[PDB]
Amino acid sequence: AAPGKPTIAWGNTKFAIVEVDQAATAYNNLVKVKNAADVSVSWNLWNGDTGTTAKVLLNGKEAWSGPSTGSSGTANFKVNKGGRYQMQVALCNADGCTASDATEIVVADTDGSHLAPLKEPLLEKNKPYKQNSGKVVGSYFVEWGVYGRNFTVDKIPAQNLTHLLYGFIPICGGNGINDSLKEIEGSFQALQRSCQGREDFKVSIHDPFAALQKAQKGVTAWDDPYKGNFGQLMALKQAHPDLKILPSIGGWTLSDPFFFMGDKVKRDRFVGSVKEFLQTWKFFDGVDIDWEFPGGKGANPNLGSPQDGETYVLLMKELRAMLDQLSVETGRKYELTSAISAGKDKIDKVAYNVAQNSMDHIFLMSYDFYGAFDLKNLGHQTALNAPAWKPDTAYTTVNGVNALLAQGVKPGKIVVGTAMYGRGWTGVNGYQNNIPFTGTATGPVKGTWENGIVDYRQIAGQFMSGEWQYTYDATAEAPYVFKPSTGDLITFDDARSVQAKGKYVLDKQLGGLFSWEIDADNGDILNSMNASLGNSAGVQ
Numbered sequence: 001a002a003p004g005k006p007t008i009a010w011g012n013t014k015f016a017i018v019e020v021d022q023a024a025t026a027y028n029n030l031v032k033v034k035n036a037a038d039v040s041v042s043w044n045l046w047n048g049d050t051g052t053t054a055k056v057l058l059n060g061k062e063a064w065s066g067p068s069t070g071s072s073g074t075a076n077f078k079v080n081k082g083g084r085y086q087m088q089v090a091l092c093n094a095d096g097c098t099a100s101d102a103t104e105i106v107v108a109d110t111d112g113s114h115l116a117p118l119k120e121p122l123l124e125k126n127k128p129y130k131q132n133s134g135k136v137v138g139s140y141f142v143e144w145g146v147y148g149r150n151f152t153v154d155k156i157p158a159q160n161l162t163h164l165l166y167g168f169i170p171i172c173g174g175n176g177i178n179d180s181l182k183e184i185e186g187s188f189q190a191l192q193r194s195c196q197g198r199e200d201f202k203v204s205i206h207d208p209f210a211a212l213q214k215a216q217k218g219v220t221a222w223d224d225p226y227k228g229n230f231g232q233l234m235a236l237k238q239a240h241p242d243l244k245i246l247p248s249i250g251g252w253t254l255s256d257p258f259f260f261m262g263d264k265v266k267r268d269r270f271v272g273s274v275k276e277f278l279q280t281w282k283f284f285d286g287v288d289i290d291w292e293f294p295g296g297k298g299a300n301p302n303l304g305s306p307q308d309g310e311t312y313v314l315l316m317k318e319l320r321a322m323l324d325q326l327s328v329e330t331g332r333k334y335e336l337t338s339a340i341s342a343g344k345d346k347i348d349k350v351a352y353n354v355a356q357n358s359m360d361h362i363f364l365m366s367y368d369f370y371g372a373f374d375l376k377n378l379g380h381q382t383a384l385n386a387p388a389w390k391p392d393t394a395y396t397t398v399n400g401v402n403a404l405l406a407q408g409v410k411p412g413k414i415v416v417g418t419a420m421y422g423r424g425w426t427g428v429n430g431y432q433n434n435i436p437f438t439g440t441a442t443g444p445v446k447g448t449w450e451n452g453i454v455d456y457r458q459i460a461g462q463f464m465s466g467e468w469q470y471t472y473d474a475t476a477e478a479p480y481v482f483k484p485s486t487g488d489l490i491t492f493d494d495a496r497s498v499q500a501k502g503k504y505v506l507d508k509q510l511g512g513l514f515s516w517e518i519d520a521d522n523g524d525i526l527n528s529m530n531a532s533l534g535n536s537a538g539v540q
């Protein structure tokens with residue numbers, strides 16, 4: 001007679017291809033990529049003949065087989081594809097095979113193939129749009145926003161984006177290499193712990209807790225291998241397979257290492273680390289370079305060289321070649337983007353007409369034109385155009401687009417920037433014709449998280465009532481709120497100035513719109529990005 005029906009033993013059923021060490025703080029120890037997950041299964045036979053061969057099947061297909069030598073047994077084998085499998089133990093002899101009931105086993109991988117889709121309700125004022133204009137609709141999510149800001153990946157209105165970018169992936173390096181980080185208390189140190197034992201100029205993760213271990217909606221079980229922002233992003237990719245999720249390297253405080261990359265030894269080490277990062281974290285779809293900025297004038301006054309332009313073009317070409325190679329290895333399309341200054345002084349230190357051939361999108365940072373870093377020369381921080389009182393205004397959105405176009409950049413490359421935050425001043429005084437921007441200021445406006453800077457959500461929530469004046473400047477295409485009695489002045493984007501940027505994008509055949517940053521919107525900004533580029537209301 002065929003053997004008795006085996007009973008799968010109680011035991012761990014959750015396994016991982018990319019293992020995460022739960023007691024590590026250095027990136028090199030935290031992650032271990034294997035070629036296959038080590039799976040184990042045990043069984044008992046409570047009644048009957050134990051058979052002469054035992055097999056483990058996944059979805060009916062043999063993953064292991066061995067001699068059946070008594071009433072219990074254990075099998076250890078490898079599974080090289082992530083997903084959920086119906087695992088059975090069968091005992092066979094010449095008279096037949098008898099299979100256990102099925103037990104599901106979970107084989108995790110960083111494409112999120114083991115996770116349920118994270119498909120959450122839109123929150124606050126976000127309304128559903130279809131991505132059917134063919135234009136870019138992008139926004140950045142910030143790794144550090146998950147604590148006091150409390151803005152986690154399940155709150156991203158992800159159906160309303162084509163592109164979701166992650167700020168920021170740091171480049172390893174201590175003194176002389178990441179000195180701009182020393183301004184943020186604990187931040188430089190944090191990076192050194194993350195990068196212990198790791199070569200400088202290789203990428204890492206700045207806050208491993210927030211990125212991979214903090215419990216978050218859908219990734220709260222103790223033995224869920226990937227939690228934090230990265231586990232949620234994986235599940236978001238299951239819900240939105242065509243969302244592009246890109247890691248952004250650099251930003252204001254983590255751009256110093258790019259200034260050493262005219263040394264091709266360092267540049268190659270960087271690019272190889274990016275390759276390895278994307279092989280490790282397969283939910284990411286490419287890389288976004290936010291080097292602030294070729295030529296200097298970013299956070300560090302000691303950095304910037306005339307050579308930076310050439311290094312930026314080389315960096316992009318080599319990044320492209322590495323992604324082209326990763327792309328054919330995997331069958332996937334990978335994107336290479338960059339966030340760049342929109343000031344013409346900085347644009348022209350790079351030959352974007354050459355670098356564009358390696359890039360899918362150029363995220364023009366058409367904001368921060370004015371702000372509490374200058375208390376004497378006030379203006380609109382993110383306006384489309386110059387205002388009527390100063391038609392020669394250098395830093396406007398149109399001027400940054402025009403500088404790119406004059407180099408020979410194709411319009412379709414250029415993605416226009418919208419701010420989901422205002423910048424502002426306090427104590428504004430000495431201005432003419434009731435235009436507060438002609439005045440000067442005594443210091444920064446009180447910010448939401450940091451001085452001089454205010455989330456759009458709080459502009460709309462707190463500063464559009466009471467004594468606050470609201471004006472929309474129709475020449476510049478820019479809103480501003482002014483509190484006459486303290487002289488608080490705040491310059492922002494709103495639904496209408498965004499609509500002006502979107503129409504402009506459509507009129508000039510540009511590539512679309514992107515925003516910084518997604519936690520600061522209440523829905524009005526991304527709603528207008530979508531509507532102004534001609535995306536249809538509703539869901540597909």
Ligand SMILES: CC(=O)N[C@H]1[C@H](O[C@H]2[C@@H](O)[C@@H](NC(C)=O)[C@H](O[C@H]3[C@H](O)[C@H]4N=C(N(C)C)O[C@H]4[C@@H]3CO)O[C@@H]2CO)O[C@H](CO)[C@@H](O)[C@H]1O
Pocket residue numbers: 140144167168184187248250251252253254290339363365368421449450453515516517
């Ligand atoms: C990593 C780190 O230093 N985090 C700091 C955090 O610094 C942030 C904020 O200062 C951001 N300011 C605003 C307006 O939100 C600043 O944003 C810059 C970003 O660096 C640039 N890159 C782009 N992209 C489109 C890619 O846009 C600009 C934006 C907007 O100007 O980013 C820095 C980090 O570079 O500040 C908080 C205090 O608020 C601090 O606790 C710490 O988390």
